[PDB]
Amino acid sequence: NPPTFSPALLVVTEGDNATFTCSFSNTSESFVLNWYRMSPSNQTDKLAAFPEDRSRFRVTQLPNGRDFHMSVVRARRNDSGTYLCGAISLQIKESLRAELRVT
Amino acid sequence: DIVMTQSPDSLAVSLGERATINCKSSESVSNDVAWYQQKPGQPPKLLINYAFHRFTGVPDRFSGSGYGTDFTLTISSLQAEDVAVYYCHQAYSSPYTFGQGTKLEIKRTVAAPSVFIFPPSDEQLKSGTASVVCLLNNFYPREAKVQWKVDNALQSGNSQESVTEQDSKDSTYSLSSTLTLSKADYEKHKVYACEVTHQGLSSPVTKSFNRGE
Amino acid sequence: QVQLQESGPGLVKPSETLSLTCTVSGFSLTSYGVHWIRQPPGKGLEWIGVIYADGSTNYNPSLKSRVTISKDTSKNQVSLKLSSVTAADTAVYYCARAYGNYWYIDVWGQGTTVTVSSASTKGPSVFPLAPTAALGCLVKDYFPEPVTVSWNSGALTSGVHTFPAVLQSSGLYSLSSVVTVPSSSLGTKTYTCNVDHKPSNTKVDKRVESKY
């Protein structure tokens, strides 16, 4: 069972927030999910991860424990691209991709 | 300074078999670890980023794993072009140290060396020294004895051997012995031979060549 | 394309400062980080430092107070300066691009071998190795390293075997490059080696066919 990444398409304007929802909760509950931006030539570019890998892309967990809000604060026009949320079981599972548009 | 320690210093699995490489960090470098492949002479090449995702244009036979201080690089079916050194790299905190590399070499059947001998060119002969080269090509294993004979006189202390790394096409090696002599001495003798002793040769092969003809 | 072309002097006198450069092409130099890496003879990779898009740098604690990494954005170049050089700095320096918000080294440079020595440069002598069949070229008595030989401008990769250089009793280096080709092409196809010795600006295209 892989993670989810909704909505499939997210059209926001230039300046406001943009938030996706990565729904994932495995059979072990010992997981660390990443938030990568896929390049036009299939070369992921990690943005953030939960728990916050300390070393504008927010990652907050909801009370249900299965949904995670991945937010792009003050979405710039260059942020339009492909995004996905991976999941690592302590093994990796990539969620379905999704598009992000910024008018 | 986080210490990246690759456990299998030298790995020599057979052709087409699984081949994994471990790289353990002395501290939490949790998922900012990249793998690199490097061949003799050429610069490094990236294979895995973030320890799981494989780079674009990278064969599917490559896989990565690990989230704490336990990282691994796996090759489903080892290919001849996979012979190289594999370095891991941490990007968690400074000084973003690297590993020490794991030499990945192919194991195969025994092969006899194709021997070739070359006389010195009239260009070098016009400068005093004269170099004669013997060429052991596409053989296995690496251990191979080469002998030098000039007018049936066993040469010693004047040659220099050089061996290539594991070939990336048929997983073989190559050796080149270079006997360096002065022109006066090169013109004072006539028969120059190169005797090659090897595991794949029941009797040592010899390559004779006489000056002039 | 995405590239990193390094260039520097082949020789460096002891106690002097080594100057290097990494001319970039392909990506916005003000949007990616360049990391310098060292590779001592017969050893692994060692990180020298970084330079981000803002213009701030992080250096290796063991190399600090001697390293200087700057960049000329109006020239797309990254410079590396190593003062009070010793014999330990002799290595192959590599500049590399950093990709991602949580960066990783994706593209690497071609490399630049630095030989910290007092002895001057020495151009190599290219002699033929005229004769499946074999042929080659002999690169002898050069200093310092390296010598990068190719065949037919790189189009002839099959059956090429460039041996590692060997130190000589005189103190110079020497290597031999060979090629295995079929006898049916010995007459029709042209085989030439390209010996490039950067420390002395010596390029040598050599035709090797036969003798009588």
DSSP string over C57-109: EEE-TTTTTTEEEEEETTTTEEEEEE-S--GGG-EEEEEEEEETTTTEEEEE-
What's the CATH code of the domain at A16? 2.60.40.10
The percent helix, strand, coil of chain A (3-state, each to 5) is 5, 50, 45
Contact between B50 and A46 using a beta-carbon 8 Å cutoff: yes
> Two tokens at B177?
């012995």
Give the Cβ contact number of residue B182 at 10 Å.
12
Among B68, B33, B27, residue whose Cα is nearest residue B47:
B33
Contacts of B92 in chain A (CB under 8 A): 55
Q: Is the dihedral of CA C183, C184, C187, C191 positive or negative?
A: negative
CB distance from C130 to chain B under 8 Å? yes
For residue B124, which phi and psi values (nearest 5 degrees)? Answer: -70, -40
Domains B4-104 and B114-210 share a fold: yes
Among C130, C132, C136, C134, residue whose Cα is nearest residue C182:
C132
Nearest residue in chain A measured CA to CA from C100: A45
Among C203, C194, C145, residue whose Cα is nearest residue C174:
C145
- Non-local (6+) Cβ contacts of B57 within 8 A are none
3-state SS class at C17 = coil
If one counts the domains in chain A, the total is 1
Contact between A86 and B65 using a beta-carbon 8 Å cutoff: no
Contacts of C102 in chain A (CB under 8 A): 46-47, 49, 53, 55
User: Using an 8 Å Cβ cutoff, are A88 and A38 in contact?
Assistant: no
Contacts of A44 in chain B (CB under 8 A): 49-50, 53
> Cα–Cα–Cα angle for C94, B103, C137, nearest 5°?
70
User: Using an 8 Å Cβ cutoff, are C79 and C69 in contact?
Assistant: yes
Edge-to-edge strands, sheet with A67-72 = A18-23, A67-72, A57-61
Beta bridge partners of residue C161, listed in sequence order: C178
- Non-local (6+) Cβ contacts of C176 within 8 A are B133, B162, B176, B178, C129, C136, C137, C138, C139, C163
Beta bridge partners of residue C97, listed in sequence order: C34
Among B115, B101, B99, residue whose Cα is nearest residue B175:
B115
For residue C183, which phi and psi values (nearest 5 degrees)? Answer: -70, -30
Q: Is the dihedral of CA C61, B30, A67, A75 positive or negative?
A: positive
For residue C168, which phi and psi values (nearest 5 degrees)? Answer: -105, 165
First-last CA distance in chain A: 34
Q: CA dihedral in degrees (B136, B138, B143, B147; nearest 10)?
A: -10
> Two tokens at B168?
């990336």
Give the gap in angstroms from C-alpha C89 to the nearest C-alpha of chain B. Answer: 18
Instruction: Tell me which residue has tokens 């790289």.
Output: B23
CA distance C56 to C75: 18
> Two tokens at C194?
């390209």
Contact between B55 and A43 using a beta-carbon 8 Å cutoff: yes
Which amino acid is it at C97?
R
- Domains annotated for chain C, with CATH where assigned, are 3-116 (2.60.40.10), 125-207 (2.60.40.10)
Beta bridge partners of residue B24, listed in sequence order: B5
Q: Alpha helix locations (H) across chain B?
A: 122-125, 183-187
Q: B4-104 has which fold?
A: Immunoglobulin-like (2.60.40)
Q: How far is it between the farthest Cα atoms of chain C?
A: 66
Contact between A47 and C106 using a beta-carbon 8 Å cutoff: no
CA distance C10 to C143: 9
CA distance C13 to C9: 11
CB distance from A76 to chain C under 8 Å? no
Q: Which residues constitute the domain of residue A22? A: 1-103
The CATH class, in words, for B114-210 is mainly beta
Contact between B53 and A90 using a beta-carbon 8 Å cutoff: no
Which amino acid is it at B8?
P
**So where are chain B's domains?**
4-104, 114-210
Give the gap in angstroms from C-alpha A36 to the nearest C-alpha of chain C. Answer: 9
Among C113, C105, C111, C112, residue whose Cα is nearest residue C35:
C105
